[PDB]
Amino acid sequence: LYFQSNAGPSIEVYVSAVSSPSRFWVQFVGPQVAQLDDLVAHMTEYYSKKENREAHTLRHVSVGQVVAAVFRHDGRWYRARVHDIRPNEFDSSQQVADVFYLDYGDSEYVATHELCELRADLLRLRFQAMECFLAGVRPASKWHPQAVERFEELTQVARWKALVSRTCTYKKTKDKEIPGIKLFDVTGELDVGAVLVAEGWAV
In the chain, where the domains are located? 1-41+122-203, 42-121
Alpha-carbon separation of residue 136 from 156, 160, 171, 184 (angstroms): 20, 24, 13, 13
Q: What's the CATH number for 1-41+122-203?
A: 2.40.50.90
Chain breaks after residues in the chain, where C lies over 2.5 Å from next N: 141, 173, 187
* Domain 42-121 falls under CATH 3.30.360.10: no
Q: How far apart are CA 128 and CA 112, in angstroms?
A: 24
How many other CB atoms are found less than 10 A from the CB of residue 6? Answer: 4
Q: How far apart are CA 48 and CA 40, in angstroms?
A: 11
Method: X-ray
Rg of the chain, C-alpha, whole Å: 18
SS (H, E, C) 163-195: EEEEEEEEEECCCCEEEEEEEEEECCEEEHHHH
37-73: b (≥16 Cβ within 10 Å) or e? eebbeebeebbeeeeebeeeebeebeeebbbbbbbee
Alpha-carbon separation of residue 76 from 37, 59, 68, 117, 163 (angstroms): 11, 23, 10, 16, 26
